[PDB]
Coordinates of C-alpha atoms and ligand atoms in Angstrom, one line a residue:
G1 CA -103.0 -77.9 143.0
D2 CA -101.8 -76.5 146.0
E3 CA -105.3 -74.7 146.9
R4 CA -107.2 -77.4 146.6
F5 CA -104.9 -79.8 148.7
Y6 CA -105.7 -77.5 151.8
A7 CA -108.9 -76.3 151.2
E8 CA -109.9 -79.9 151.1
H9 CA -107.5 -81.7 153.2
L10 CA -104.8 -80.9 155.3
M11 CA -107.5 -77.5 157.0
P12 CA -110.2 -80.0 157.4
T13 CA -108.1 -82.5 158.9
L14 CA -106.9 -80.1 161.6
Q15 CA -109.7 -78.9 162.1
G16 CA -111.3 -82.4 163.1
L17 CA -107.8 -83.0 165.1
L18 CA -107.4 -79.3 167.1
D19 CA -109.7 -76.7 168.2
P20 CA -109.7 -72.9 167.1
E21 CA -107.5 -72.0 169.3
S22 CA -104.9 -74.6 169.4
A23 CA -104.9 -74.6 165.9
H24 CA -104.0 -71.4 165.7
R25 CA -101.4 -70.9 168.3
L26 CA -99.3 -73.6 165.1
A27 CA -100.6 -71.4 163.3
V28 CA -98.5 -68.3 164.4
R29 CA -95.9 -71.1 165.4
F30 CA -95.6 -72.8 162.0
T31 CA -95.8 -68.9 160.2
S32 CA -93.2 -67.1 162.8
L33 CA -90.6 -70.5 161.5
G34 CA -91.7 -70.0 157.4
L35 CA -93.3 -73.5 157.4
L36 CA -95.3 -72.5 154.2
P37 CA -95.7 -72.6 150.4
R38 CA -93.3 -70.0 149.2
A39 CA -96.2 -69.1 147.6
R40 CA -95.5 -69.2 143.6
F41 CA -98.1 -66.5 142.2
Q42 CA -95.9 -63.0 141.7
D43 CA -97.4 -59.7 141.9
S44 CA -98.0 -57.9 139.2
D45 CA -97.6 -53.8 138.6
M46 CA -101.3 -53.3 138.2
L47 CA -101.4 -54.3 142.3
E48 CA -99.4 -52.4 143.2
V49 CA -100.7 -49.3 145.6
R50 CA -99.7 -45.9 147.5
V51 CA -101.8 -44.4 150.1
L52 CA -101.1 -43.6 154.1
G53 CA -97.3 -42.5 152.7
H54 CA -96.5 -45.7 151.8
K55 CA -96.3 -47.6 148.3
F56 CA -97.4 -51.5 148.8
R57 CA -97.1 -54.0 146.1
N58 CA -100.2 -55.7 147.0
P59 CA -103.2 -54.4 148.3
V60 CA -104.2 -57.7 150.7
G61 CA -102.8 -57.3 154.4
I62 CA -103.1 -60.0 157.1
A63 CA -106.0 -58.8 159.7
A64 CA -105.6 -57.9 163.5
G65 CA -105.7 -61.0 165.2
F66 CA -103.4 -63.8 163.9
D67 CA -100.6 -62.1 165.2
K68 CA -101.9 -60.4 167.9
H69 CA -98.7 -60.0 169.8
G70 CA -96.1 -59.7 166.6
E71 CA -94.5 -63.3 166.5
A72 CA -95.0 -64.0 162.6
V73 CA -94.2 -60.5 160.7
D74 CA -92.0 -62.0 158.4
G75 CA -93.5 -65.5 157.7
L76 CA -96.5 -63.8 156.6
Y77 CA -95.4 -61.8 153.9
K78 CA -93.9 -65.1 152.7
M79 CA -97.9 -66.0 152.8
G80 CA -98.2 -63.1 149.8
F81 CA -98.9 -60.2 152.2
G82 CA -99.0 -56.8 150.8
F83 CA -98.7 -55.5 153.9
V84 CA -98.8 -56.8 157.6
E85 CA -101.2 -55.5 160.9
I86 CA -100.3 -57.0 164.3
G87 CA -101.7 -56.1 167.6
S88 CA -104.0 -55.2 169.3
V89 CA -101.0 -54.4 172.1
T90 CA -102.1 -53.8 175.2
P91 CA -99.9 -51.3 177.3
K92 CA -99.6 -54.0 180.2
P93 CA -99.8 -57.8 179.5
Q94 CA -102.8 -59.6 179.8
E95 CA -104.5 -62.5 179.5
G96 CA -107.5 -62.2 178.0
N97 CA -111.3 -64.0 178.9
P98 CA -111.4 -68.0 179.3
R99 CA -111.5 -70.3 177.9
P100 CA -113.1 -71.7 175.7
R101 CA -113.0 -68.6 174.0
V102 CA -113.7 -68.9 169.8
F103 CA -115.9 -70.9 167.9
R104 CA -115.5 -72.1 164.9
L105 CA -119.1 -71.8 162.6
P106 CA -117.8 -74.3 159.7
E107 CA -121.7 -74.2 157.7
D108 CA -120.7 -70.3 157.7
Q109 CA -117.1 -69.6 156.6
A110 CA -117.3 -67.8 160.3
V111 CA -115.6 -68.0 163.2
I112 CA -117.2 -66.4 166.9
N113 CA -114.4 -64.8 169.0
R114 CA -114.2 -63.2 172.1
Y115 CA -110.7 -63.4 173.4
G116 CA -110.4 -60.2 175.4
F117 CA -107.2 -58.4 174.2
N118 CA -104.9 -61.8 175.5
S119 CA -102.2 -59.2 174.5
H120 CA -98.2 -59.5 176.0
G121 CA -98.5 -55.9 176.5
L122 CA -96.0 -53.0 175.0
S123 CA -92.6 -53.6 176.3
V124 CA -92.5 -57.0 175.3
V125 CA -94.1 -56.6 171.6
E126 CA -91.5 -53.2 171.4
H127 CA -88.5 -55.1 172.1
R128 CA -89.7 -57.8 169.1
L129 CA -90.6 -55.5 166.7
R130 CA -86.9 -53.5 167.8
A131 CA -84.7 -57.1 166.7
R132 CA -85.9 -57.2 163.4
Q133 CA -86.7 -52.9 162.8
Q134 CA -84.2 -51.8 160.3
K135 CA -84.9 -55.8 158.4
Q136 CA -89.0 -53.9 158.3
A137 CA -86.8 -50.1 157.1
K138 CA -86.2 -52.1 154.0
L139 CA -88.8 -54.3 154.0
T140 CA -91.4 -50.6 154.0
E141 CA -89.3 -49.6 151.6
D142 CA -90.0 -52.3 149.5
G143 CA -93.5 -52.1 149.2
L144 CA -93.9 -54.2 152.0
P145 CA -95.2 -52.0 155.4
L146 CA -96.6 -52.6 158.5
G147 CA -99.0 -51.4 160.5
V148 CA -99.5 -51.6 164.4
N149 CA -103.0 -52.1 166.0
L150 CA -104.1 -50.4 169.3
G151 CA -105.8 -51.3 172.2
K152 CA -107.1 -50.9 176.2
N153 CA -106.3 -52.7 179.0
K154 CA -109.1 -54.5 181.3
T155 CA -108.9 -52.2 184.0
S156 CA -107.9 -49.5 182.6
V157 CA -109.1 -45.7 184.2
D158 CA -108.4 -43.6 181.5
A159 CA -109.0 -45.1 178.0
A160 CA -107.6 -42.5 176.1
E161 CA -104.0 -43.0 177.8
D162 CA -103.6 -46.4 176.7
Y163 CA -103.7 -45.3 173.9
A164 CA -101.1 -42.7 174.2
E165 CA -99.3 -45.3 175.3
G166 CA -99.0 -47.4 173.3
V167 CA -98.4 -44.2 170.6
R168 CA -95.2 -43.6 172.2
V169 CA -94.3 -47.1 173.0
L170 CA -94.6 -48.1 169.2
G171 CA -95.6 -45.8 167.2
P172 CA -92.1 -45.6 165.9
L173 CA -91.9 -48.8 164.9
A174 CA -95.0 -48.4 162.8
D175 CA -95.9 -47.6 159.2
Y176 CA -99.5 -46.9 161.1
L177 CA -101.2 -47.6 163.5
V178 CA -104.5 -48.2 164.5
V179 CA -107.0 -46.7 166.9
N180 CA -109.1 -49.8 167.9
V181 CA -112.3 -48.6 169.2
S182 CA -114.2 -51.6 168.4
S183 CA -113.4 -55.0 169.8
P184 CA -116.4 -56.4 170.7
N185 CA -114.9 -58.1 173.3
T186 CA -113.7 -54.9 175.5
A187 CA -116.6 -53.5 178.0
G188 CA -117.2 -50.0 177.0
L189 CA -114.4 -49.6 174.6
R190 CA -117.3 -48.8 171.5
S191 CA -118.8 -46.3 173.2
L192 CA -116.1 -44.8 172.6
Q193 CA -116.8 -44.6 168.9
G194 CA -119.2 -42.0 170.0
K195 CA -118.6 -38.8 168.6
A196 CA -117.2 -36.5 172.1
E197 CA -115.1 -39.7 172.6
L198 CA -113.6 -39.9 169.9
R199 CA -112.8 -36.4 168.9
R200 CA -111.2 -36.4 172.6
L201 CA -109.2 -39.1 172.1
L202 CA -108.3 -38.9 168.8
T203 CA -106.5 -35.4 169.7
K204 CA -104.8 -37.1 172.5
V205 CA -103.3 -40.2 169.7
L206 CA -102.3 -37.4 167.2
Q207 CA -100.8 -35.0 169.8
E208 CA -98.7 -37.4 170.3
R209 CA -97.8 -38.8 166.8
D210 CA -97.1 -35.5 166.5
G211 CA -94.5 -35.1 168.8
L212 CA -92.7 -38.2 167.3
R213 CA -89.8 -37.9 165.2
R214 CA -90.3 -37.4 161.5
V215 CA -88.8 -40.5 160.3
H216 CA -91.2 -42.4 163.5
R217 CA -94.0 -41.0 162.5
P218 CA -96.7 -43.1 161.8
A219 CA -99.7 -42.7 160.0
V220 CA -103.0 -42.9 162.6
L221 CA -105.9 -45.1 161.2
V222 CA -109.3 -45.7 163.6
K223 CA -111.0 -49.3 163.5
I224 CA -115.0 -49.1 162.8
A225 CA -118.3 -51.8 163.8
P226 CA -120.2 -53.3 161.9
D227 CA -123.0 -52.5 164.1
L228 CA -123.0 -48.6 164.1
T229 CA -125.9 -46.4 163.7
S230 CA -126.2 -44.1 160.9
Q231 CA -125.8 -41.4 163.2
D232 CA -123.0 -43.2 164.6
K233 CA -121.9 -43.2 160.5
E234 CA -122.1 -39.4 160.0
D235 CA -120.6 -38.6 163.5
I236 CA -116.9 -40.7 163.0
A237 CA -116.8 -39.0 159.4
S238 CA -116.9 -35.8 161.4
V239 CA -114.4 -36.3 163.4
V240 CA -113.2 -37.4 160.9
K241 CA -112.7 -34.2 158.8
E242 CA -111.7 -31.8 161.4
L243 CA -109.2 -33.7 163.0
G244 CA -106.8 -35.0 159.9
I245 CA -108.0 -38.5 161.2
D246 CA -105.8 -40.3 158.1
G247 CA -107.9 -43.0 157.4
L248 CA -110.1 -45.9 158.1
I249 CA -110.6 -49.2 158.2
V250 CA -113.6 -50.7 157.9
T251 CA -114.3 -52.6 159.3
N252 CA -114.0 -55.0 163.5
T253 CA -116.8 -57.9 164.1
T254 CA -120.2 -57.8 164.0
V255 CA -121.8 -58.5 167.3
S256 CA -125.6 -59.1 165.0
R257 CA -126.2 -62.1 164.2
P258 CA -127.8 -62.6 160.8
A259 CA -130.2 -64.4 159.8
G260 CA -129.3 -67.8 158.9
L261 CA -126.5 -68.2 160.8
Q262 CA -126.9 -72.9 160.5
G263 CA -123.7 -73.0 162.9
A264 CA -124.2 -75.5 166.1
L265 CA -122.0 -71.9 168.1
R266 CA -124.3 -69.5 166.7
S267 CA -125.7 -68.2 169.9
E268 CA -121.7 -67.9 171.4
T269 CA -121.1 -64.0 173.9
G270 CA -118.8 -62.7 170.7
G271 CA -117.7 -61.1 167.5
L272 CA -118.5 -62.7 164.1
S273 CA -116.2 -63.1 160.9
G274 CA -115.8 -64.7 158.0
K275 CA -118.5 -65.0 155.1
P276 CA -122.2 -63.5 157.1
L277 CA -120.0 -60.8 157.7
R278 CA -118.4 -59.5 154.1
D279 CA -121.4 -57.7 153.2
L280 CA -122.3 -55.6 156.2
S281 CA -118.5 -54.7 156.1
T282 CA -118.9 -54.0 151.8
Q283 CA -121.8 -51.1 152.8
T284 CA -120.0 -50.2 155.9
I285 CA -117.5 -49.5 153.4
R286 CA -119.6 -47.9 150.8
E287 CA -121.6 -45.7 153.0
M288 CA -118.1 -44.3 154.4
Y289 CA -116.1 -43.9 151.2
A290 CA -119.3 -41.6 150.9
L291 CA -119.5 -39.5 153.8
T292 CA -116.0 -39.2 153.9
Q293 CA -115.8 -37.6 149.9
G294 CA -113.6 -40.5 148.9
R295 CA -110.7 -38.0 150.2
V296 CA -109.7 -40.8 153.6
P297 CA -108.2 -43.6 152.6
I298 CA -110.3 -46.7 153.6
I299 CA -108.7 -50.2 154.2
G300 CA -111.4 -52.9 154.1
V301 CA -112.1 -55.8 155.9
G302 CA -114.6 -58.0 156.6
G303 CA -115.3 -61.9 155.0
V304 CA -112.9 -61.2 151.9
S305 CA -111.8 -64.9 150.8
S306 CA -111.9 -63.9 147.2
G307 CA -111.1 -61.9 143.9
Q308 CA -114.2 -60.4 144.3
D309 CA -113.9 -60.7 147.4
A310 CA -111.0 -58.4 146.7
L311 CA -112.8 -55.6 144.4
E312 CA -115.7 -55.2 145.8
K313 CA -115.0 -53.3 148.4
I314 CA -112.6 -51.6 146.4
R315 CA -114.4 -50.3 144.2
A316 CA -116.9 -49.8 147.0
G317 CA -114.4 -47.4 148.4
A318 CA -111.2 -49.4 149.3
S319 CA -107.8 -49.3 148.9
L320 CA -106.6 -51.4 150.9
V321 CA -107.9 -55.0 151.7
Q322 CA -107.1 -57.3 154.6
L323 CA -108.2 -61.3 155.1
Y324 CA -108.3 -63.7 158.8
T325 CA -110.6 -65.7 158.6
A326 CA -110.3 -67.2 155.6
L327 CA -107.2 -68.3 156.4
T328 CA -109.4 -70.2 159.0
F329 CA -111.4 -72.0 156.2
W330 CA -108.9 -72.0 153.4
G331 CA -104.9 -71.8 154.3
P332 CA -102.7 -69.8 153.1
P333 CA -103.1 -70.7 149.4
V334 CA -106.4 -68.5 149.3
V335 CA -103.9 -65.5 149.5
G336 CA -102.3 -65.5 146.4
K337 CA -105.7 -67.3 145.3
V338 CA -106.9 -63.5 145.5
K339 CA -105.0 -61.6 144.6
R340 CA -104.8 -63.7 141.0
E341 CA -108.5 -63.9 141.3
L342 CA -108.4 -59.3 142.2
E343 CA -105.4 -59.3 138.6
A344 CA -108.2 -61.0 136.5
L345 CA -111.1 -59.8 137.3
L346 CA -109.7 -55.7 137.3
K347 CA -108.0 -56.6 133.2
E348 CA -111.9 -57.8 132.9
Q349 CA -113.1 -54.7 133.8
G350 CA -111.0 -52.8 131.9
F351 CA -108.8 -51.1 135.0
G352 CA -105.7 -51.0 135.2
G353 CA -104.7 -51.2 138.0
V354 CA -106.2 -51.8 141.4
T355 CA -106.1 -47.5 142.1
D356 CA -108.1 -47.0 139.2
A357 CA -110.7 -49.5 140.9
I358 CA -110.8 -47.6 144.0
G359 CA -114.4 -45.8 144.6
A360 CA -115.5 -46.6 140.8
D361 CA -119.1 -47.3 141.7
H362 CA -119.7 -44.1 142.9
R363 CA -118.2 -42.7 140.0
Ligands
FMN401 C1 -110.0 -65.0 165.9 C2 -109.6 -63.3 166.3 C3 -109.1 -62.0 166.6 C4 -109.6 -60.6 166.2 N1 -108.7 -59.9 167.2 C5 -108.6 -58.5 166.7 C6 -108.1 -57.7 167.8 O1 -107.2 -58.8 168.4 N2 -107.5 -56.3 166.8 C7 -109.1 -56.1 166.0 O2 -108.8 -54.3 165.5 N3 -109.6 -56.4 165.5 C8 -109.0 -57.8 165.9 N4 -110.4 -59.7 164.5 C9 -111.0 -59.0 164.2 C10 -110.2 -58.3 162.1 O3 -108.7 -57.6 162.2 C11 -111.6 -58.3 162.1 O4 -112.2 -57.1 161.5 C12 -112.6 -59.4 161.7 O5 -112.2 -60.7 161.4 C13 -113.2 -59.6 159.8 O6 -112.4 -60.4 158.4 P1 -112.6 -61.4 158.5 O7 -113.6 -61.4 158.0 O8 -111.3 -61.3 157.6 O9 -112.0 -62.5 160.0 C14 -110.3 -60.2 165.4 C15 -111.2 -61.4 164.5 C16 -110.4 -62.8 165.2 C17 -111.5 -64.4 164.1
7L7_402 C1 -99.9 -79.1 161.4 O1 -99.4 -78.7 160.9 C2 -99.4 -77.6 159.6 O2 -98.5 -79.0 158.9 C3 -100.0 -76.8 159.4 C4 -100.5 -75.6 160.1 N1 -101.0 -75.3 160.6 C5 -99.4 -75.9 158.0 S1 -98.4 -77.6 156.8 C6 -98.3 -76.4 155.3 C7 -99.0 -74.6 156.1 O3 -99.0 -74.2 155.3 N2 -99.0 -75.0 157.2 C8 -99.7 -73.7 158.1 C9 -99.2 -73.1 158.4 C10 -100.4 -71.9 159.0 C11 -101.4 -71.2 158.9 C12 -102.4 -73.0 158.2 C13 -101.1 -73.7 158.1 F1 -101.8 -75.0 157.6
ORO403 O1 -109.3 -59.4 171.3 C1 -110.4 -59.3 170.8 O2 -111.6 -60.1 171.3 C2 -110.7 -58.6 169.5 C3 -110.7 -58.0 169.4 C4 -110.8 -57.2 168.1 O3 -110.8 -55.7 167.7 N1 -111.6 -57.8 167.4 C5 -113.1 -58.7 167.6 O4 -113.5 -59.4 167.1 N2 -111.6 -59.8 168.9

C-alpha cells in the first residue's frame, strides 16, 4: 500500500516540486520530527547480526551523507534502520561547494553529488550527540548502534591531524568510527588510500582511538572507493591486516560514468550513486573479502534498493549493508521492503539467518 503510494505518487511529486538539495533538507526535517510511516515490519531474529563488538537488530543501515550533522538519528531508527551512520563531519564548520551541487538521474535511478563536505563541524555535532548520549547508549544495548563518519576540512594542512581530532571529539560518542578517505569531492583526499599514506594515517588514528577510555573506545573502519586499481586494493588489504583495522565500508560513490547512463545530467562533475554503482560495489566487496580472508568485517553499500541487492552483497562478503539513494526514489517504505525481501530470500536459499549467508559465494 504505502510502498506503491510513495513510489508512484509522493516521491515523484516531491521531485517535481523541489530541487534535490531542497528535497533532502525537507526530508531531514521530516525525519528529525518523526513524520514518517512508523514502520510496521517487526525485525525477525533471522536478521540479527553480531559484528564490530555489537548486536545489530537488522543489517540495513542508513549510509553516510543523509544525516551529515547528526540531526535525524532517532527518526532514522523509527524508519526501521538497524544502525545509523552520521557524517561526514569535518573538524571546523564549512560550507561545501556552491549550488547546485546535487543532481537526479531518474532514468538511471541514480544521483550525482558534489557537496564537498558541507559540515556543521565537530563541536556542533559533539553537543548534539551529547544531548542524547544515554538515549543512544540504550539504543546500542537494544541492537541499534551508531556510527560516526569523519572527514577533512578543505584548507587543512595536515589530513591525519583532522582525522585524529575527529577521533578525540566524536569517538567517545560512537559505536564505530569511519575514516572517510574516498570522497571524490575533496581535492587530494582519495590519495590517502595509497599504501604509505594510508598506513601513516591509520597508525595515527588507531593510536588516538586506543587512548580513549574502554567504554568510549569505538571500532575503526575505513571507507573506500569503487574506482581503485587492483594494486590499490591489495595495498589496502595489506595495511588493514598489518594494523588490525576493525572493518571496511565498501563503497563510496564512483567518479566513473558507466556506459548506458541516460540521465540528462550524467556529465555533471561528482560522485555517482544508485543503481549504476550497484554491481561495481558488489564486486569490490567480493574482492576485498577475498583479500582479507573473510576475517575483516565489511559494510556493503552502493545501489541497494531491494532484498536481492542486499543479499548479493551479503553473499559477496558484507556483514551489514547500507543505502541512501534508494530513498530519493522510493522513500521510507523502501527500508521495510528491503528487510522483508531479504528475510524471504534467506529462507528460500536455505540460510538460517543473515549470519549464515555472509561470504556464502566464496564457499
Ligand atoms: C548526496 C550524497 C552525499 C553523500 N555524502 C557522504 C559523506 O558525507 N560521507 C561518505 O562517507 N559518504 C557519502 N555519501 C556516499 C554514501 O554514503 C554511499 O557510500 C553512496 O551513495 C552509495 O550508496 P547508495 O547508492 O545507496 O546511495 C554520499 C552520497 C550521496 C548520494
Ligand atoms: C512534503 O514532504 C513530505 O510529506 C515528506 C517528506 N519529505 C514525507 S510525508 C511522510 C514521509 O515519510 N515523508 C518523508 C520523510 C523522509 C523522506 C522522504 C519522505 F517522503
Ligand atoms: O560531501 C560530499 O561531497 C560527499 C562526500 C563523500 O564521501 N561521498 C560523496 O559522494 N559525496
